[PDB]
Write a protein that binds this ligand. Structure first.
Ligand SMILES: CCC[C@H](NC(=O)[C@H](CC(C)C)NP(=O)(O)CNC(=O)OCc1ccccc1)C(=O)O
Ligand SMILES: [Ca+2]
Ligand SMILES: [Ca+2]
Ligand SMILES: [Ca+2]
Ligand SMILES: [Ca+2]
Ligand SMILES: [Zn+2]
Length: 316
């Protein structure tokens, strides 16, 4: 909408107060003009028609319970935009400052979030398995990263390419969580998953097996559920990424960690310069090795560590 840029204040899903960029024209809208061609957050009003209505508020204060998922969707989209711009010199998901759109309050008791090809969508959860999913910065960045992937590598959402697609979203979701530096970890969705159970998560990158996912290629799922296991086999790549950054010895194979920033540079380069829609795990290894070679040199520790990590998870 046409209007003047303003700054509202509210509380997110976890009860934390934050400022949000809004736009004033009769109402205050969740429209952030400070980033690219805008970040726009919508109310789906418990229905499934998208995007719904651009979020409008009478007083620029967002402290109602109903407001919380919108506050976090809007704010964490901003953080994710900043990560891609400041860290990777990428302007929005398309590299050309495309407007970023999110809808919250999607459906009823909806235990998921997704990128629908054009925008991000967040359920409120059923209050048992999830609370509103935009409350997780790793979740928001996971979803926006699907858009990045679709505009770049274009990894097809099934089988091995699909598991890479998923791992890329978990990896950058986590790197954005570290970027914001609030309770960061290598777990996925812990801030919004199972409010009745402390200390768990939807997935773990550091130990995928904790939540039932493979941490070695020999344990890959080859059935048809979950698009050929895209959220399951992602554990193999998530484990490799974790090892590249933090190091460790996994099934007897030792990996020297090189840190999160270098992990991010290597995987961002792989995603944007080497991966294709049909890339498999073996091809990801090659892409990551080449990316590390480009950035740090063939004889670098960084290249050696990438190889160690993929060796450790059984990907040659
Ligand atoms: C409990 C849900 C677990 C998993 N979802 C996830 O891991 C994350 C949300 C997490 C980070 C909180 N959602 P996601 O991976 O974006 C869901 N993906 C998805 O719906 O893809 C199908 C699709 C939807 C729309 C267009 C094209 C394809 C899943 O969908 O199995
Ligand atoms: Ca208000
Ligand atoms: Ca965390
Ligand atoms: Ca996390
Ligand atoms: Ca929990
Ligand atoms: Zn995903």
């Amino acid at each position: 909408i046409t209007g003047t840029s303003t700054v509202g204040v509210g509380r997110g899903v976890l009860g934390d107060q934050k400022n949000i960029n809004t736009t004033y024209s009769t109402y205050y809208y969740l429209q952030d003009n400070t980033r690219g061609n805008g970040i726009f957050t919508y109310d789906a009003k418990y229905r499934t028609t998208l995007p719904g209505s651009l979020w409008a508020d009478a007083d620029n204060q967002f402290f109602a319970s109903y407001d919380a998922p919108a506050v976090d969707a809007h704010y964490y989209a901003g953080v994710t935009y900043d990560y891609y711009k400041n860290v990777h010199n990428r302007l929005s998901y398309d590299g050309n400052n495309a407007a970023i759109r999110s809808s919250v309050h999607y459906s009823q008791g909806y235990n998921n979030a997704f990128w629908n090809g054009s925008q991000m969508v967040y359920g409120d959860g059923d209050g048992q398995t999830f609370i509103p999913l935009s409350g997780g910065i790793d979740v928001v960045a996971h979803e926006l990263t699907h858009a990045v992937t679709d505009y770049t590598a274009g990894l097809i959402y099934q089988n091995e390419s699909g598991a890479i697609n998923e791992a890329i979203s978990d990896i950058f979701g986590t790197l954005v969580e570290f970027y914001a530096n609030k309770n960061p970890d290598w777990e996925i969705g812990e801030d919004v998953y199972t409010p009745g159970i402390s200390g768990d998560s939807l997935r773990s990158m550091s130990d995928p097996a904790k939540y039932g996912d493979p941490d070695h290629y020999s344990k890959r799922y080859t059935g048809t559920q979950d698009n050929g296991g895209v959220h399951i086999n992602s554990g193999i790549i998530n484990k490799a990424a974790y090892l590249i950054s933090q190091g460790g010895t996994h099934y007897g194979v030792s990996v020297v960690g090189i840190g999160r920033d270098k992990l991010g540079k290597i995987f961002y380069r792989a995603l944007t310069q080497y991966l294709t829609p049909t890339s498999n795990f073996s091809q990801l290894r090659a892409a990551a090795v080449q990316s590390a070679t480009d950035l740090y040199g063939s004889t670098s520790q960084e290249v050696a560590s990438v190889k160690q990590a993929f060796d450790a998870v059984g990907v040659k």
